[PDB]
Amino acid sequence: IMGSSVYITVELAIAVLAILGNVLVCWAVWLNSNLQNVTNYFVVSLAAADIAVGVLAIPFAITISTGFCAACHGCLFIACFVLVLTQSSNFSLLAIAIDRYIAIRIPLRYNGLVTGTRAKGIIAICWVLSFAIGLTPMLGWNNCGQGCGEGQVACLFEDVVPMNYMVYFNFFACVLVPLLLMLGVYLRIFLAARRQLADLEDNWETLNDNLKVIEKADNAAQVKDALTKMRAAALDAQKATPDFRHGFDILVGQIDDALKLANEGKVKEAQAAAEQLKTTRNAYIQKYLERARSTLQKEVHAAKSLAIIVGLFALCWLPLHIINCFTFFCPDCSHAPLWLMYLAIVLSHTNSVVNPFIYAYRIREFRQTFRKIIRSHVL
Amino acid sequence: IMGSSVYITVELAIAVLAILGNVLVCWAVWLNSNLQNVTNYFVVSLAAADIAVGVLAIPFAITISTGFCAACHGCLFIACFVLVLTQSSNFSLLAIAIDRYIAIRIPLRYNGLVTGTRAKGIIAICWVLSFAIGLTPMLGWNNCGQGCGEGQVACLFEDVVPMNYMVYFNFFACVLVPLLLMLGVYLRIFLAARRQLADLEDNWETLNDNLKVIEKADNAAQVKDALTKMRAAALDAQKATDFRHGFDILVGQIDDALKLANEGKVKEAQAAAEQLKTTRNAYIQKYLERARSTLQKEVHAAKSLAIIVGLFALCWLPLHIINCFTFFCPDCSHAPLWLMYLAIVLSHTNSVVNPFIYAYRIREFRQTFRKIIRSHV
Ligand SMILES: CCNC(=O)[C@H]1O[C@@H](n2cnc3c(NCC(c4ccccc4)c4ccccc4)nc(C(=O)NCCNC(=O)NC4CCN(c5ccccn5)CC4)nc32)[C@H](O)[C@@H]1O
Ligand SMILES: CCNC(=O)[C@H]1O[C@@H](n2cnc3c(NCC(c4ccccc4)c4ccccc4)nc(C(=O)NCCNC(=O)NC4CCN(c5ccccn5)CC4)nc32)[C@H](O)[C@@H]1O
């Protein structure tokens, strides 16, 4: 088999999975109602760019690996467009990553900040900078101011796109920063799930232990110390908690009634009051947990969701762009074989097509809507 | 006197200093034919943007300080437009600095790359960049999501333009990046002189010595050893650089001096080598004339850049340095009213005196400014 026939056969397959995997998501949003929220409009817009990446961009990238006699400013257009469409995916994916940062770390402000209005404008900002970075060489910064005769060059990417443009401008800004942002967004969401866990479990253990002491502590002032450490832990739990505000005002009250029952000879009532506030028997503690729980198990999901996206985004775009930097800074030294460099192109067009499907299939509601269309409309 | 009455007074004074000095720069380039090159097209293009700053941006950046009752997207439009205008003064100053980087370190490809079509193009890139950045808040990244009633905010800058836009985005990319680039441009040009200076003052001295040897050089083959060093030095000088014609004859004359030196020393070596002394050496004399011309030409374009960078950092730093302090440390100590407003005036001063000082350092500009005065006056 040829070296070009294999590239095109594989490269055209990704274009199919591009359109297929992203219209199914574009199908599940148009059908299921509980998926039409703000977060998933970005998935609609990312899949919309991904379909433009599959329909229009991948054929324009195969066009570039041929190198036929064509005019400069025309062959420049082809390379600018595949740049434009590959800018849109990395930018729309960045919007989903930042949206998850808002609804998870700043939840009491998510409604009045990410409405349907600015979400329609955030995507409009992504596509505007895609056409700004994209159509930059067309306005001068290209490589034909001065084989096929006059006016016609070999239509390859490195021939019409300046390599310093790809090194200094395109990579450093449209792949590096978008990755270092989704990195910092994943990290601060990951770390947020780690701080909420350690303080809840430690507060918890102090409550059960102290109530365990008090119940089994007697003939000493240990009860006074145990109530003090219980009060402090309930307040630390109040600082993080926001139902939960009302219930915490009452837990503080029950510790005071506990301290008022610990005050005058009512040592058994102080033990009863520790039983009032002991986990098993407190309506407010149990309510406090399920909140502090539900957020943990939910945003650890959206943490691993980002861990998979960043782990896939860095994995796909860097090989193509790292090879670029060696060609510009180290052109005397060694290259990569003729097959390994085209794979760096294949991987680039993978992240731009299989990203909206991974985070979709990781959510249980998208996983149930997909099955309802495959069994019904497909068959 | 008022703290606001002096603000608009000082601001309007700067608005005129923009108008005159840069129309003067454009008055000069339109007169002299030899000023109509490609680099001074970037100086006119920059001088044109600084005229717009004093005509539109300064009247807009004052209305922004009043904090008057107006709809948000009306104060946004006044606030995004001042971000589009100051944008193009730093991106056109960047184009001058990039142009001066090419002409100095890569001169054998300057005219074949920086045509009037791509200079018409590069400037368009700088301007299309500004709209793509300045009109980001108008596309959503503003402040009126959720005094004067409903829908109308106190038309201040920080009331319509976010601060994560003016730190995470507008400073990181439109003050820090443009300034650090022109810093590296100055750095690579400043180091270009020391390397073109050394290897020549090396080649020249290696050449002076061996012939000064050859003059008082003894009988025997020691004269032949000295010629071998001169040939290698002449090859090094030919490597680092009409002109290429004079070296092949020079290399030809050293080989002409070589065979004669291989056989009879006393008489054969003296004629050719003595005419390789600067006096009877036409090709060395043409060669030294070029290096003397190029060396102190790029240093006056290196000091011209240390000034362009120094003036640029002296003004666009105090504004965005305070922007970062109010964004990453809003609780801690503030800069007072006048000092924060001074930083606004600073960032507006560079926008009216930056093409000037650079153009005024050009000697062809300096005569064209005095010819305008005597004719007008
Ligand atoms: C969000 C941003 N979006 C993008 O960046 C998108 O733009 C595309 N792209 C981005 N850099 C691209 C890029 N660098 C060029 C790079 C390279 C070339 C080929 C394959 C991978 C990378 C290169 C390396 C070495 C020399 C020149 C360029 N070469 C291409 C693109 O088509 N090559 C297909 C057609 N070329 C070719 O047959 N060359 C042959 C290969 C062998 N000889 C080599 C190797 C070493 C030295 C000299 N000769 C040169 C001729 N495409 C790119 C890509 O599809 C991205 O998705
Ligand atoms: C391509 C780059 N282009 C540019 O950067 C241009 O855009 C303009 N600009 C860029 N950041 C700007 C910027 N930050 C706001 C910053 C500041 C404010 C005033 C003066 C200098 C800097 C600030 C600091 C602290 C608090 C809020 C904002 N404030 C203004 C601009 O007009 N203030 C005039 C109208 N506001 C005001 O009276 N507030 C008062 C100031 C005093 N109280 C303070 C200070 C501390 C704490 C509380 N209260 C707040 C209200 N203008 C800017 C400026 O004209 C630049 O030339």
Numbering used by the authors:
A (entry chain B): 3 to 148, 158 to 208, 1001 to 1045, 1060 to 1106, 219 to 308
B (entry chain A): 3 to 148, 158 to 208, 1001 to 1044, 1060 to 1106, 219 to 307
Article passage:
The adenosine A2A receptor (A2AAR) is a prototypical member of the class A subfamily of G-protein-coupled receptors (GPCRs) that is widely distributed in various tissues and organs of the human body, and participates in many important signal-regulation processes. Abnormal function of A2AAR has been linked to neurodegenerative diseases such as Parkinson’s disease, Huntington’s disease, inflammation and coronary heart disease. The signal transduction is accomplished through binding of its agonist in the extracellular pocket that triggers conformational changes of the 7TM, which in turn creates enough space in the intracellular region to accommodate G protein binding. Using A2A adenosine receptor (A2AAR) as an example, we have functionally validated six mutations with increased basal activity (i.e. constitutive active mutations) and 15 mutations with decreased or abolished activity (i.e. constitutive inactive mutations).
In this study we determined the A2AAR constitutive active mutant I923.40N in complex with the agonist UK-432097 to a resolution of 3.8 Å. All mutations were made based on a previous crystallized A2AAR construct with the third intracellular loop (ICL3) replaced with BRIL [referred to as wild type (WT) A2AAR hereafter, unless further mentioned]. We then tried co-crystallization with another agonist, UK-432097, which has similar potency to CGS21680 and was the first agonist that crystallized with WT A2AAR. One asymmetric unit contains two molecules and these two are identical in the conformational state, herein we only refer to molecule A as the densities in molecule A are clearly better than in the other molecule. 2(a) and 2(b)]; such a hydrophilic interaction can also be suggested by the continued electronic densities between the two residues [Fig. 2(c)].
